[PDB]
Structure 1
Amino acid sequence: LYSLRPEHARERLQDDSVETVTSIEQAKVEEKIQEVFSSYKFNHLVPRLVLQREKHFHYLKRGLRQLTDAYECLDASRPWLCYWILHSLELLDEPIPQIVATDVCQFLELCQSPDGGFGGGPGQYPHLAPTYAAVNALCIIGTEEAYNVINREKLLQYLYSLKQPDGSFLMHVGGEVDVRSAYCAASVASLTNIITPDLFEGTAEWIARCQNWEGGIGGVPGMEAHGGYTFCGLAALVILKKERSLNLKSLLQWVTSRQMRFEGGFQGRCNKLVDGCYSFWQAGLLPLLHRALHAQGDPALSMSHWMFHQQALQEYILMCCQCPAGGLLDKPGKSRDFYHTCYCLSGLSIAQHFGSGAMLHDVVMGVPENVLQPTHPVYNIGPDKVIQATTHFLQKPVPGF
């Protein structure tokens, strides 16, 4: 275990004897993480990095039907809860009974707006975030029933209704603009084959304006580089085949700098704390940058590993992000939630599976039963689900209006 090596203690923060809110909060975190790392030593057992699959499964399978009122704050993110859960079950190789799947399909039908797109619950106005989640969920299920839920003509209209003259998209009518919208739109439009020639005109250029002095990408031009927004920006460009619109090298240096030398996990922004959900948003950028640089015929690219410490990330997730009761989380001390379960699992999968053309190479830390189903770095749903959905929707012509 890379994290448990003696020389690893040298990776502890060096505050230069100048404490500030930033160094103090970081130190508190490393302190808590170190206690977790050493728990084995102090208890005299052999470290067993085990992914609590059955614990995670009961939690997920149960959350898929009902949730406590603690979830009232997510009453407008119901298609997200479906996606997060269905995708977590998918990474854990757990199946979706044809009856559950049909129930999910019917629920999303209620969340779908007569104007295209999906709202965060039955009867809510449509928004791009739950539209992305609803579509990804229906693709994970992958039945004709599921695919048919989506009204493609109204979806294209909806996308057109959010499109801005500058290339950006609103998240919803009368709503805000940020890089998430470009990705939500490019993800649902591509999967469903509704991309018209002008739908994403200026979009690649707008996203390129979000890349700042740091190498990363901010929510809108001028903003601090952020891990969640950077994934959306790059993943959207990959879909649009315009990754070249970015300075891929400065982006590569920025994301690799986000992995925490001590904790092994990824931080969302420079000088902020480690967070398990960034195992996906940040580490997920490496496969995408691999694909892009390779498309440019980069000769120096690895043929077995992503450009981050796959081992250390798997260790942070396995040792520090699981809730014994099932479910995954931000960092030790945090409470579990379906969002973090989905992205901690999503990032683990990315950390375990490498691939580049004909090259395939796994790295599964701990017990071999830890290996998860692979995840598509652009859509974050199983690669099979991606091929299966796109091939299906390619049987339908792009809505002509």
Structure 2
Amino acid sequence: PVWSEPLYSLRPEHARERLQDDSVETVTSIEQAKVEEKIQEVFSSYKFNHLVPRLVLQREKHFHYLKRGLRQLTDAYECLDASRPWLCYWILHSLELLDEPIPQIVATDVCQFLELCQSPDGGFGGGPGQYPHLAPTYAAVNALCIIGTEEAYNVINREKLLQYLYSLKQPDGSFLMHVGGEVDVRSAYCAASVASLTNIITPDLFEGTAEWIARCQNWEGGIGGVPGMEAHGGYTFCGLAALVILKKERSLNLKSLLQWVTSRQMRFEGGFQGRCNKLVDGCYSFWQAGLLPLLHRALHAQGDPALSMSHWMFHQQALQEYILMCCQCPAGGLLDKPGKSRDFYHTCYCLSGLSIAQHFGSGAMLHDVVMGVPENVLQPTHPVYNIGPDKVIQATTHFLQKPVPGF
């Protein structure tokens, strides 16, 4: 019809999705209300301006921001001086999503830089001279796989990498993030990711890891950092993804996990929150929404007959609307929410989430949903590694040619 508003967030009924504080104001409700009001303005801007809304992914703007950042950053990034392989990964992945080629000058320089970050005893550090750590090790490997050249693959010292993983492994099945460091579910995921990609997984490497991870699932259905802690999207993603890599998703109560993650999508904003009663945030477009593709694959593997064959169990349209309308910086780059400043981390995760929301795949079945102008479509991303599915296949195949360290 003519009166029909195609954008879900702009429909008149949508206003009914506003927070109901039951007249009991608390810090949580007050904060949530502030966000909704700010987001309501974004939604209503077209109406008050008397313009027909057109949702455009500012590709050219994002490309400039990325292209320059891959080379040089301001002192605003001093807080990430111990996370440079992450800067490499976040940027290269964003470019990959936007379907921008990586010139060999760049690829070769990234490789050489990443090898300067590699430790003499395995793993990668946050910068040259820094001790290895599982987070930048995960980032570096992903970054080299996105490049995917013989050079890129060759940078990784696999025997030392395996030695490194073992030096971090704990008796209870967990892993330290680095020597003398902290333990939480992120380490299990970082380790499984790099180990699977490089084919260095030995029979006992992940002994007890699945059980340890399963102990992190709590009464909420989600997964916390360590056993006993509140369920959170970053940890839940790490947990399920690591379990998927280890082929042990079944250790979890997938049903309660599914109900928890689906409940994390904000009825009004359309984006996802990190934990119950906290605020919406663009990066969770990946951490939270990325769980649906994983849960779909797990449930389907159990022969679940009620599974949809064209959509994920989340409102794909609403997430895309949230990202497109509220998470883009006019100058390029993406963000947490309106009012927040852009950064490469949110740029990487908002785009990753957008891609997830646009593409549904289940074997032969394929179905896209591209909100706004058709040029908004991005390249697909693998739900476990968050790098191109083709890069995953290429990397694994290449590493399967080599024997698991020690044979």
Q: TM-score, normalised by structure 2?
A: 0.98
**Runs (5+) with no aligned partner, structure 1:** none
Query: Aligned equivalents of 2:286 and 2:172: distance in 1?
Result: 29
Query: Aligned equivalents of 2:183 and 2:292: distance in 1?
Result: 26
Query: Aligned equivalents of 2:104 and 2:406: distance in 1?
Result: 33
Distance apart, 1:10 and its partner CA: 0.1
Query: Aligned equivalents of 1:216 and 1:392: distance in 2?
Result: 35
Distance apart, 1:218 and its partner CA: 0.1
SS of the equivalent of 1:103 reads: helix
Distance apart, 1:307 and its partner CA: 0.1
SS of the equivalent of 1:312 reads: helix
Query: Aligned equivalents of 2:244 and 2:294: distance in 1?
Result: 7
Distance apart, 1:133 and its partner CA: 0.1
Distance apart, 1:338 and its partner CA: 0.1
Among 27, 40, 50, the alignment partner of 2:33 is 27
Query: Aligned equivalents of 1:352 and 1:229: distance in 2?
Result: 24
Deviations 1:101-150 (A, max 9, x none): 00000000000000000000011000000000000000000000000000
SS of the equivalent of 1:42 reads: helix
Aligned counterpart, 1:48 = 54
SS of the equivalent of 1:184 reads: helix
Deviations 1:289-340 (A, max 9, x none): 0000000000000000000000000000000000000000000000000000
SS of the equivalent of 1:264 reads: coil
Aligned length: 401
**Runs (5+) with no aligned partner, structure 2:** 1-6
Query: Aligned equivalents of 1:305 and 1:144: distance in 2?
Result: 37
Aligned counterpart, 2:336 = 330
Deviations 1:177-216 (A, max 9, x none): 0000000000000000000000000000000000000000
Query: Aligned equivalents of 1:237 and 1:73: distance in 2?
Result: 31
Distance apart, 1:352 and its partner CA: 0.2
Distance apart, 1:81 and its partner CA: 0.2
* Structure-to-structure mapping, 1:196-215, within 5 angstroms: 196-215=202-221
2:22 is the counterpart of 1:16: yes
Distance apart, 1:286 and its partner CA: 0.1
Distance apart, 1:39 and its partner CA: 0.4
Deviations 1:14-64 (A, max 9, x none): 000000000000000000000000000001111010000000000000000
Aligned counterpart, 1:315 = 321
SS of the equivalent of 1:167 reads: coil
How many percent of aligned residue pairs carry the same amino acid?
100
Query: Aligned equivalents of 2:55 and 2:382: distance in 1?
Result: 25
SS of the equivalent of 1:354 reads: strand
Distance apart, 1:400 and its partner CA: 1.2
SS of the equivalent of 1:291 reads: helix
Deviations 1:76-110 (A, max 9, x none): 00000000000000000001001100000000000
Aligned residues: CA RMSD: 0.5
Aligned counterpart, 2:228 = 222
Distance apart, 1:385 and its partner CA: 0.2
Query: Aligned equivalents of 1:54 and 1:300: distance in 2?
Result: 41
Deviations 1:212-257 (A, max 9, x none): 0000000000000000000000000000000000000000000000
Distance apart, 1:70 and its partner CA: 0.6
* Structure-to-structure mapping, 1:2-401, within 5 angstroms: 2-400=8-406
Query: Aligned equivalents of 2:234 and 2:376: distance in 1?
Result: 26
Query: Aligned equivalents of 2:332 and 2:50: distance in 1?
Result: 24
Query: Aligned equivalents of 1:307 and 1:197: distance in 2?
Result: 34
Query: Aligned equivalents of 1:288 and 1:303: distance in 2?
Result: 14
Aligned counterpart, 2:4 = none
Distance apart, 1:357 and its partner CA: 1.3
Distance apart, 1:66 and its partner CA: 0.2
Question: Which stretches of structure 1, 4 residues or longer, exceed 3 Å deviation after superposition?
Answer: none
SS of the equivalent of 2:53 reads: coil
Query: Aligned equivalents of 1:358 and 1:302: distance in 2?
Result: 13
Query: Aligned equivalents of 2:381 and 2:154: distance in 1?
Result: 24
Deviations 1:329-360 (A, max 9, x none): 00000000000000000000000000111100
Distance apart, 1:365 and its partner CA: 0.1
SS of the equivalent of 1:268 reads: coil
Distance apart, 1:12 and its partner CA: 0.1
